Design a protein around this nucleic acid. Structure first.
Ligand SMILES: Nc1ncnc2c1ncn2[C@@H]1O[C@H](COP(=O)(O)OP(=O)(O)OP(O)(O)=S)[C@@H](O)[C@H]1O
Ligand SMILES: Nc1ncnc2c1ncn2[C@@H]1O[C@H](COP(=O)(O)OP(=O)(O)OP(O)(O)=S)[C@@H](O)[C@H]1O
Ligand SMILES: Nc1ncnc2c1ncn2[C@@H]1O[C@H](COP(=O)(O)OP(=O)(O)OP(O)(O)=S)[C@@H](O)[C@H]1O
Ligand SMILES: Nc1ncnc2c1ncn2[C@@H]1O[C@H](COP(=O)(O)OP(=O)(O)OP(O)(O)=S)[C@@H](O)[C@H]1O
Ligand SMILES: Nc1ncnc2c1ncn2[C@@H]1O[C@H](COP(=O)(O)OP(=O)(O)O)[C@@H](O)[C@H]1O
Ligand SMILES: [Mg+2]
Ligand SMILES: [Mg+2]
Ligand SMILES: [Mg+2]
Ligand SMILES: [Mg+2]
Ligand SMILES: [Mg+2]
Lengths: 369, 378, 372, 369, 369
DNA sequence: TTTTTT
C-alpha cells in the first residue's frame, strides 16, 4: 500500500542502524560501526543494502530524494537506544573482531553482535598470525635479553608478561605498574613494540596526570583517554631534586576507578569509561605526596636491569652496579620496529600470555616491596 | 474540511504530547515520557500512535511529508504549559512507575498521570523483584558483613539504611552525609550496589563543588545534578597536606535548598531543581572553613569498621585500631556487581527500608556528635 | 481579492498582535499577552482566532501553509512600535489583571489596555480569595509566630509588611532590604511563601551581582531580572574570614537605577528594566567595600528573632541571646507550602497591606541605624 | 515584458530605497528613513506604496510571494551607494525633521532630502512646543533649583547649559564632561529629563568603555553608540581605594575621535561614527592612569551643590560644606518625569539654548581647574 | 538545447567575470572591478549586461529565478584563476585608473586591462587636479606650518613626504612609520588629509594587531586591511605603567610579509595581500617586549614640533622644550577638511611627491637614530 | 578558557 516504508521496514530488520546513548546513530558498513554525526551515512547504506532486496524494491533506490524519504522513515522508527562496548574479551580490528578466549577471528556479520566502536586502526593478517617465521625468533631474541629467563629474574618476567598481556582486556584495572630502570635499558623498546602491536588503542601522555589536579576547569588529557586500553606516562622528571613536584596520591586513587571525572574544553559531558592499563615509565625511584595503606594497594614495580651500550663506553658501564648484563646496542632496531616489523609476532605473543594469566579471571595485583 | 487536522485533533485528545515550563515538548512513547532538546520527538509519536487511529486515518501516516503537516498543526494547538515531576514517592522505570507507598507497579495510562521525565534507564522485571532467591541471600550476607547487626552498631546501621532508602524519593533533602572509614571497608562496594540498583538517577560529581564558588562562569558539575536523586562525591583529599583547600561552609548550605544556581556552557538557564541525596565518600575526617549552628544541622556521618584483607596481611590488619572485623576478601564479588546480579534484590531491600522509615514524612536528621570540631563547639 | 489578505486585515483590526520596542511580537491568547523570541507564535493566534471569523474564512485556516501566508501579511502590515508594562499598580495573571487600587479583577478586553507582558503563570480563583478560611487562620498563626505582634517588635513588623507588599508593584524601588537573623528563624519560609504567592514574577539569582562587575562579557545572572518584581540573593557568606570578597557599593548604586546594564549570551541588547524588590537573606551582618552617605541611603534591615527547635535542643536555645522566643518545629509545614496551600491567603494578605502602605505613593525608605 | 519588473522600476524611480556605504538598505516609510538588518523591510515599503500605483499594478502586491520577486529585482537594481547623516543641525523625529537654526518643521519630501537615519522615536507635537504653559513654569523652577541663577554660579550654569544643548547636534565633540556632586544633588534628574527629551538618540552604556580594551572580540557596549547623540555613564567606583581599576587615559583619547573601532556579535563592521556627547556622572573625582597635556585638553567638570532632603535630616545637612543650599524633596517628581510630562518644555529650552551657544560654531572647551 | 546555458556562455566571453586565487568572484560594472562576498555581484552584473545581448536573450533576464540559473552555470564554468593587482603604480578611481609615472587617466575599456580590484570610492574630476589654485595656496600654507622647511628640518620633511607619497603605490612595504609628537602638533590633521585624499583605500584598525596574537579564529580587524594602501593605529597607550602590554615584535615581523593571515566571520578566506603603509600616531616612545637588530631595520620615526595653541595659553608653550613654533590655532579648519575641500589639491601634491622618490624603485628605509 | 560563530 505504501512502499519506501516496506523498504525501510526491511532495512530495519537487519539491525544495520542503531541508536546510541548519546543520541546519535551508528551505521554498520565496510564491516565496521561508524558514527553519523561526522558524515551523513544512513544513506549510502541504503545504496549498499540495495542488492539484498527484491528487484522491484531495488530499482527505487537508484534515485535521491527517495533515499531521503527512506532515511526519514528509518529515523522515525528507532525509539529505544542500545549500549555499546560491553564485551571485554574481544579485540576489534579494522576488518573484524578477534576472540581472545579461542583465538578465532570473526569477519562479516559474525563480528557484529559485539557493538565495538573502537579499533586498532589497521587490518588483520592471518598469514602473519602464525608462530614460526624469520621474524618471531628475532622478536624472541629481542625480548629475552631485556628480561632474561633466569630463575633470579623469574617473578619480574612474570609481572612483565602479565601487564603486557593485560593491555588487551577492555575492562577497568586497578593498578599503577611502574617500569623502573636506568637509561638505555629497553623500556622504550617495549613501549614502541606495544604501540606497533595494539595500534590506535594506545596513548602516550605527559606528567600532568600524576602531579596536577584533575577537575580544576577543563582537562584535555581525560577525554582522549576514553575507551583506550593502554596509557604510557613517560618523560618523568627527577623527584629527589629540590622543590620538585611530587606524585599526587589522590591522582593515583582516582585513576583506578571505573569512571574518571573530568571534562574537555567547551563540553558539558563529565564522565569517562576507564579501560586503560596505566604504565609509568620512570628513571628514578618514585616518591609520593603521602604514603598510606590506600596507596600501597595500587602499585606494582617491574625492574629493568640490562644495559645496551656501544663499544665506546662498554667497560665504563661494565663496572657499574646498577645492571646485571651489558650488551651491544643495535642501530637498525628502532627503524625495523617503526616499520611495523614485529607487529603480528608481538600480537601472537600477547595473546598467548593472555590465555595463560587472565583466562579464568582478569585482575592485577600490587607488589609494595 | 481537513483530514490531517482531524488526525491532529484526535491525537491531541489522547494527551500524548505536552509542553513544559522549560520550553520543551514531551511525548509518551513506550510507557515513558521522553524528550530531546535538539530535535523534537513528535513525529516518532505520530508514527507510533498510528495503530490507535481508524484505518483511513492510519494509512496516511506512512508518508514522512504528512507527518510534518500533522506535527505543525499539533504545535499550533498547544498553547499552555504544565508542571513536571511533582510526585516524590514514585520511582519511574523505562516501562512504568513503581509506587513506594505499597509496592505496586503501574503501566499504561495509570503511569501517565505521574509526569515523570526521568527514569532509571532499564526495564522493571516482576519475576526478580522477590524476597526468595539465592541472590537475595548473598546480598543480605554481603550487607550484614559490611554493616553488622551487633547492638554496639545499631544506630549506625539504622542511619545507613535511612540514607540509602532516601535515594528513591524525588524531593529535597536538607542534609549531607559522609561515608567515613579506612581502606578496604566497603564504601565503593555500597556505591556500586546503589548505582546498579537505581540506574540513571545516580550521578557522580567532582570534588570541585565543595571548595569552589558556584557562580563564576559555567559550572557543568552543578547543572548536571538536575532532578537526580543521588549524588556521590568521591576521593576527598587530606586537608592538612599541601595544595589542599577547605570545605566552604556556604556551599554546604547552598546544596540543601530546593533550587540551586548554576549554568552549563553556552546557556542562559541559571536554576536547577534539587532532588538529590548528597554523599561524600571520604577517608579522612572533613575540615571546614568556619563552624556555626547553621553548619551543625546539615551534616551526618556513617562509619565503616570492617576490613577485607587477603590472607597475607591479615595479622597486620588485626593489629590496627581502626577495624573491628578482618573478614576475608572475596575476589569475584566486584565482577558480579557490574553484571547487575543484585539489581532487583537491592531494589527490594531499598523499598522495604523506605516503607519502614520514610512513609509518614521523608526527612533526614543531623548527627553532630560524630565530628571533632563539632564536638568541641557543641 | 485575496481572502488570505482580508483575513490578515481583519485580524489586524482586533488589535491582537503588536510589535514591541525590543523587536518582539506579542499576541493576545487566552486573556494574556504572550511572546517567544526564538519561535514567533503568531500562527498560534491565527489558529485560535478563527472562531471569530465568518464561515467562509475560518475554513481556510486549517492548512499550515495558508497560516504562513497570513502571518507574512501580518508581518508586513505592522510598522510602528508600542511601549509595554507602563502600569505599576496592576497585577497580571494567566487569565486577567487584578487592580490593586480597589481589588477588582478584570478579564477579557477590559484587562487588555494594560499591555502587561509578564505574569504569575497561574490562574486567579475568586473563591479562594476570601478573607476568612481555615487556611487564612493557619497562615495568620504562622506569620504571627515568625514576626510577633508585640510592642517592641512594631517597627520591624511594619517594615516586614511594607517590603512584602511592595513586592507587588511594577515600578522601581531604591532600597536593598536585608533579612538578617540566626539559624532556624523563618527566612526561607517567608521566601517560599512569597514564591508560592507571586509565581513567575519571582526570581532567585546568584551572589555575583553583589561582588563582581556586571559588564565584563555576558552575564545571564543579571540579565534575567528584566521586568521581575522580586529578586532574591539568599544565603550570603561570611566576610570575617580571609579569602572573602566584600560587597561593592557601586553594585548597590547600580541596582537601584531604573535601567541596569548587562547582556546574556549571544545577545546584542544591553539594557534591562528594573522593577525588582531585592532582598538579601543573610546570616551575618554585611560588610561593605566603602561607606558613605550615598550607600546608607539605599539599605534597610529586617530582623528575625524567633527560634523553631526540636524538643531535644529546646533548652540550649533559651540560653542564647540571639532569640527572643522559642517554638516547636513543624515537620509538615514545608510540604504544605510546596503544595501551594496558602497561595491565595498570602495573596489576599499582601493586597490588604498594599492598600494600607503604598496606595497614595509607592516608596521604600532606608533604616541606617541597624547596620553596625 | 514583465509586470513585477516594471513595478520594481517605478518604485526605484520613486527614490524610496537606498544603499548606504556601511551596507544597509534604508527605506523611506511613514516620513522617516528606517533600517533593520535583523529584519529587512523592503517588503513593508512595497506593501505600503501600492496606493501610488495604477489599479492594475496595486492588486498584484497583495500576495506575499509576489512581493519577494519585486524585492529581489530592487536588490539587483541598486549598484551604487550614498552617504547618510551629513547635516549636523537637523533633529529628526518620527514624523519629520526640525531645523535648529530657524525652528521650522519639515515633513514629506521636505524632510526626505536630509538622509537622517536616526530618530527620537516619538512624534513632534506643535501644540505643546510652546513657551508659555504651566509645564514650562514648573520646569523652570526645577532647573533653577538644581542650578541657581546667582553670580558665583554663573560660569558653572553656562557650562551646564552648553553641555546640555550640545546633545542635539549630530557632529563630533572633543571633550568629555563629568557631572560631579554629592548625594541627592539632581544629576539623575537631569539625566532623566534629557532622556525623556531626546528619546532614542540617548544611550547608556557600562564602565568598560573607560577601564577596559575596546578592541578584543565582540563589544556591543561600544557598537551600540553608533550615530547616537548622547552617551551616559553612571555610578563610578571610588578609585582612591584598593581593588579599583583606574580610568585608562587612552580610552579617553579614542572616544573623542570621529570614528571608534569596535564590532558587535555576528558582524564584520568595525567602525562606528561618533556623534555623541559623553557625560559621566559621579560622586568622586576621577582618577586617571597618567596625567598629560593631551588629557587635560579633553575634560570638563560641572558641579552640583544643591541638596534635597527630607525634613528629618535637613538640620544635619546645613552643617556640610559640600552643599550651598538645601531644598525640600518632592516625592512625586520622579513619577511625573517618567510619564513624559516635561518633554516638549525641556526640548524648547534645549533649542533656545542651542541657538544661543552653538549657532556660529559648535565646540566644547575643557576646564582643567 | 539550453538557452540559459548559451546566455551564460555569452556573458563569459565579455570577460566581465573573473575568479581570483582565494576564490573571489570579481565583476566589471560601472567602469570598475568589484568584489563583495555579501552582496550578490554576479546577479547584479547579469541584469546590468542584458542590453549587450540579442533581444530574444535579453527578455529572459528579467526574472529573478532565471538570473540564478545563469549565475549557477557561470560559477561552474569558472575553473581557472587569474592574478590581479599586479601594477603597483596605478591609482584606481570610481570611473577610471590614473597612471602615476605618466599622468594619463584611462577610463572605460582602457582601464579594464589593469585588474584594479579596489577603488578610492569617488570619481576623478580633472578640473580640480590643477597645479595653481587658491585651495593649493591654503594647503601649501598648512603643510608648511605643520612641518617647516628649515635647514635642520629637511631630513625630516623628506621622510614625511616619502611616507606620505608611498601610500599611493600598491605594493608591499618593509617599514612601520611612527608619527611621534607632542599634543596639538598636527598628526591627526595629516591623517584626516590623507584620508580625504585617498578615500576607500584608507583603513583604520585597532591596536590588537600589535599587542595581541593575530591567529585566533575570526579577526575582521586584520581581514579589513586586504589590498588597502594605508593603515592607521592611532593612540597607543604608555607602556611604563602598572600593568601594560608590549608591541610584541613578532607581530612586527608578521606585519611586513605580503600574506598576513586572518579571516572574517562566516568566510574561509584566510590569506590577505599586504599592500599597506602602517602608520601609528603615538604620543610616547614605543617599547617592545624584546629588542633585536632585525627590528630597527623595519622601523621609521618622523617628528612633529610646531604647536598650534589658543591665545589663552600661548605664553606657556614658548617655554616648553619639545616645541619649535607656537603658531595660532584655527577653528574652522577641521570643518573644511571634513568637507573634502583639499581632496584633489592634496592628491596632486601627493602625486608630485611620488614622482620624485619612488620613480626608480619604491623602497622605504628605516631610521634607527 | 568561554563565547562567538556556525
Ligand atoms: N561482604 C564482602 N565480602 C567479601 N569481600 C567484600 C565484601 N564487600 C566488599 N568486598 C571486597 O573487598 C574489597 C574492598 O574494597 P572497597 O570496599 O571497594 O574499597 P574502599 O572501601 O573504597 O577503600 P578505599 O577506596 O581504598 S578508601 C573489594 O575488593 C570488594 O569487592
Ligand atoms: N510558624 C512556624 N511554626 C512551626 N515551624 C515553623 C514555623 N515557621 C517555620 N517553621 C519551620 O522551622 C524551620 C525553620 O527553618 P527556616 O524557615 O528555613 O529558617 P532559616 O532562617 O531559613 O534557617 P537557616 O538555617 O538560616 S536556612 C523550618 O523547618 C520550617 O519549616
Ligand atoms: N528641583 C527639585 N525639587 C524637588 N525635588 C527634587 C528636585 N530635583 C530633584 N529632586 C528629588 O531629589 C531626589 C534626589 O535627586 P537625585 O536625582 O537622585 O540626585 P542624585 O545626584 O542622583 O544623588 P545620587 O544618585 O544618590 S549620587 C530625588 O527624589 C528627586 O526626585
Ligand atoms: N597649519 C595649521 N593651521 C591652523 N590650524 C591648524 C593647523 N594644523 C592643525 N591645526 C588645528 O590645530 C588643532 C591641532 O589638533 P591636532 O593637530 O589634530 O591634534 P594632535 O596633533 O593630533 O595632538 P593630539 O591628538 O591631541 S596628541 C586642530 O584643531 C587643527 O585643526
Ligand atoms: N634486545 C636488544 N638487542 C639489541 N639492542 C637493543 C635491544 N633492546 C634495545 N636495544 C637498543 O638499545 C637502546 C635502548 O634504549 P631505550 O630502549 O630507549 O632504553 P630507555 O628507554 O631505558 O632509555 C635502543 O636504542 C635500542 O636500539
Ligand atoms: Mg624514551
Ligand atoms: Mg573506594
Ligand atoms: Mg534558608
Ligand atoms: Mg543618581
Ligand atoms: Mg589626535
Amino acid at each position: 500500500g505504501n512502499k519506501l516504508f516496506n523498504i525501510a521496514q526491511r532495512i530495519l530488520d537487519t539491525n544495520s542502524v542503531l541508536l546510541t546513548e548519546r543520541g546519535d546513530h551508528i551505521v554498520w558498513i565496510n564491516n565496521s560501526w561508524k558514527f553519523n554525526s561526522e558524515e551523513p551515512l544512513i544513506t549510502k547504506l541504503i545504496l549498499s543494502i540495495r542488492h539484498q532486496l527484491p528487484k522491484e524494491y531495488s530499482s527505487e533506490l537508484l534515485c535521491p530524494r527517495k533515499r531521503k524519504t527512506v532515511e526519514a522513515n528509518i529515523r522515525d522508527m528507532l525509539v529505544d537506544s542500545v549500549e555499546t562496548d560491553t564485551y571485554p574479551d574481544k579485540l576489534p580490528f579494522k576488518n573484524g573482531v578477534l576472540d581472545l578466549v579461542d583465538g578465532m577471528f570473526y569477519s562479516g556479520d559474525d563480528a557484529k553482535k559485539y557493538t565495538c566502536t573502537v579499533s586498532t586502526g589497521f587490518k588483520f593478517d592471518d598469514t602473519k598470525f602464525v608462530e614460526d617465521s624469520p621474524e618471531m625468533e628475532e622478536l624472541m631474541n629481542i625480548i629475552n635479553d631485556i628480561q632474561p629467563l633466569t630463575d633470579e629474574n623469574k617473578k619480574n618476567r612474570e609481572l612483565y608478561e602479565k601487564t603486557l598481556s593485560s593491555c588487551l582486556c577492555g575492562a577497568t584495572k586497578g593498578c599503577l605498574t611502574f617500569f623502573f630502570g636506568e637509561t638505555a635499558t629497553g623500556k622504550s623498546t617495549t613501549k614502541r613494540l606495544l604501540k606497533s602491536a595494539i595500534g590506535d588503542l594506545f596513548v602516550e601522555t605527559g606528567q600532568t596526570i600524576l602531579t596536577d589536579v584533575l577537575d580544576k576547569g577543563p582537562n584535555p588529557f581525560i577525554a582522549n583517554m576514553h575507551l583506550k586500553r593502554s596509557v604510557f606516562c613517560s618523560e618523568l622528571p627527577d623527584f629527589a631534586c629540590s622543590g620538585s613536584k611530587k606524585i599526587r596520591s589522590d591522582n593515583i586513587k582516582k585513576l583506578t576507578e571505573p569512571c574518571v571525572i573530568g571534562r574537555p574544553c567547551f563540553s558539558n559531558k563529565i564522565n569517562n569509561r576507564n579501560h586503560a592499563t596505566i604504565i609509568i615509565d620512570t628513571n628514578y625511584k618514585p616518591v609520593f605526596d603521602r604514603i598510606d595503606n590506600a596507596l600501597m594497594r595500587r602499585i606494582a614495580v617491574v625492574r629493568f636491569r640490562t644495559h645496551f651500550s656501544q663499544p665506546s663506553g662498554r667497560e665504563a658501564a661494565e663496572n657499574n652496579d646498577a645492571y646485571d648484563k651489558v650488551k651491544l646496542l643495535d642501530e637498525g632496531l628502532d627503524g625495523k620496529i617503526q616499520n611495523n616489523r614485529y607487529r603480528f609476532a608481538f600480537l601472537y605473543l600477547l595473546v598467548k600470555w593472555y590465555k595463560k594469566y587472565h583466562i579464568p579471571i582478569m585482575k592485577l595485583y600490587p607488589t609494595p616491596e
